[PDB]
């Protein structure tokens, strides 16, 4: 899909072993499969069906997503930052697209 | 026989859900069923599954917590077609399952016209 723009809010550093809250959004219609056109025919589903967040290659959260997740899917969850490196965010589209965002995190 | 039951049974592996160990947070009244905020927490859960019992396709999301999660909290926004029960199911590392359930009243139906 076009214009699937990731927006992630997360601190750019933390004390070693500290918890940070991660907020991850992406713009997407999330066509559910339940909407009807002007003629009353169902409009086929096309959603992001999975979202992963990794910290330094290790999973933070892996979400299997269904059509009842809202337009512009939002996920908020908590990561334990034991060492510096990066968050990697991945969203998998029904249409075959893969969206990614990468966020650096320091340990101070 | 129901889809909620079928999904619930696949998650539990045949055990009954206990209670306790889970928090499901949802509004009493959701003004806009297109975007209902939900938070779940279940200390020590390997996964939390969310079901919307009055929706045409009841499965909402499954949150799989990996080793780098600090705790087992997740928040999202969901669609509810109509006033209904929202169910959270959490599974522990030992495979036991706990359930929470709550009624959400919906003004504007979600899921699409």
From TrEMBL, chain A:
Positions of the Sulphur oxidation protein SoxZ domain: 9-101
Coiled coil: none
Cross-referenced Pfam families: SoxZ (PF08770)
TM stretches of this protein: none
NCBIfam families reported in the protein's UniProt record: SoxZ_true
Record's protein name: SoxZ protein
Species whose genome carries this gene: Paracoccus denitrificans
Gene that specifies this protein: soxZ
TrEMBL record, chain B:
Domain Ig-like SoxY: start-end pairs: 10-111
Domain of life: Bacteria
Protein's name according to its UniProt entry: SoxY protein
Species per Swiss-Prot/TrEMBL record: Paracoccus denitrificans
């Amino acid at each position: 899909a076009d214009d699937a723009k990731p927006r992630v809010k997360v601190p750019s550093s933390a004390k070693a072993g500290e918890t940070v809250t991660v907020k991850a959004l992406i713009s997407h219609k999330m066509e559910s499969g339940q909407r009807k056109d002007a003629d009353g025919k169902l409009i086929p589903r096309s959603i992001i069906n999975r979202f992963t967040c990794e910290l330094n290659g290790v999973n933070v959260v892996d979400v299997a997503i269904d059509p009842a997740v809202s337009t512009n899917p939002y996920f908020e969850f908590d990561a334990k930052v034991d060492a510096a490196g990066e968050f990697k965010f991945t969203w998998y589209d029904d249409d075959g697209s893969v969206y990614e965002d990468v966020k650096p995190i320091a340990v101070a | 026989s129901s889809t909620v039951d079928e999904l619930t049974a696949a998650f539990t592996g045949g055990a009954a859900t206990g209670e306790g160990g889970l928090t499901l947070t949802a509004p009493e009244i959701a003004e806009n069923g297109n975007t209902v905020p939900i938070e779940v927490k279940a200390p020590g859960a390997v996964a939390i599954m969310l079901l919307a019992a009055g929706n045409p396709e009841p499965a909402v999301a499954t949150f799989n917590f990996g080793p780098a999660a600090a705790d087992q909290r997740a928040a999202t926004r969901i669609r509810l077609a109509q006033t209904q029960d929202v169910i959270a199911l959490a599974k522990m590392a030992d495979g036991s399952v706990v359930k929470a359930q709550t009624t959400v009243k919906v003004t504007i139906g979600g899921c699409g016209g």
